[PDB]
Design a protein around this ligand. Structure first.
Ligand SMILES: *[C@@H](CC(=O)OCC)[C@H](C[C@@H]1CCNC1=O)NC(=O)[C@@H]1C[C@@H](c2ccccc2)CN1C(=O)[C@@H](NC(=O)c1cc(C)on1)C(C)C
Length: 180
């Protein structure tokens, strides 16, 4: 009940469907007009937010200090609405987390919560041949359509779903220092 309730509140207050030319993604609204999507979504000068074409004012693809992509892209949107500020839920450090959930919005008829089990700080992987850092891994057969899904626990917004191989699933980590 409560684990699913927290996820449904994240969907209600902090999600949107983002469409780029490469597909539909669950977009996590962090605060003000800032949303995160996987970098591989390759957002352009405009995106659709719940079907409405919206100009992107600023876009940041995040990399670690060694220049390895994190697969987090932050977009500042040209619109009125401000997202509920969920920066207080974002961890300061990399860690492992037991019994996590993924909150999904895009590519399905209604928002749903999937329990993905225990999550580990997995390090770097090769995502379609390109090194990607700070992955959070779970043993769940995530599929196309899950990207952007919000990995969370009650009071903890941990990452966004970016990839998988039919056995395991991977989220890009969210760290508090990615925002001021
Ligand atoms: C979300 C995006 C999506 O649905 O794309 C529209 C079809 C995908 C979720 C994945 C798909 C399979 N299961 C999932 O959880 N994510 C992807 O498809 C990502 C992004 C692409 C990509 C596209 C363009 C440019 C760069 C990258 C690659 N990819 C992957 O998940 C891959 N998986 C891996 O490389 C991999 C490595 C390891 C350890 O685990 N998975 C592809 C499925 C090959």
């Amino acid at each position: 009940g409560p684990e699913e309730e927290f996820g449904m509140s994240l969907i209600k207050h902090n999600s949107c469907v983002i469409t780029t030319e490469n597909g539909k993604f669950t977009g996590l609204g962090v605060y003000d007009r800032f949303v995160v999507v996987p970098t591989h979504a390759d957002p352009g000068k405009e995106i659709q937010v719940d079907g409405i074409t919206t100009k992107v004012i600023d876009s940041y693809d995040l990399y670690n200090k060694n220049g390895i992509k994190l697969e987090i892209t932050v977009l500042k949107l040209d619109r009125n609405e401000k997202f509920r500020d969920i920066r207080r839920y974002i961890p300061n450090n990399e860690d492992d987390y037991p019994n996590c959930n993924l909150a999904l919005l895009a590519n399905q008829p209604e928002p749903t919560i999937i329990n993905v089990g225990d999550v580990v700080s997995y390090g770097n992987i090769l995502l379609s041949g390109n090194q990607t850092a700070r992955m959070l891994k779970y043993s769940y057969p995530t599929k196309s359509g899950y990207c952007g899904g919000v990995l969370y626990k009650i009071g903890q917004v941990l990452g966004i779903h970016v990839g998988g191989n039919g056995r395991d699933g991977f989220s890009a980590m969210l760290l508090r220092s990615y925002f001021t």
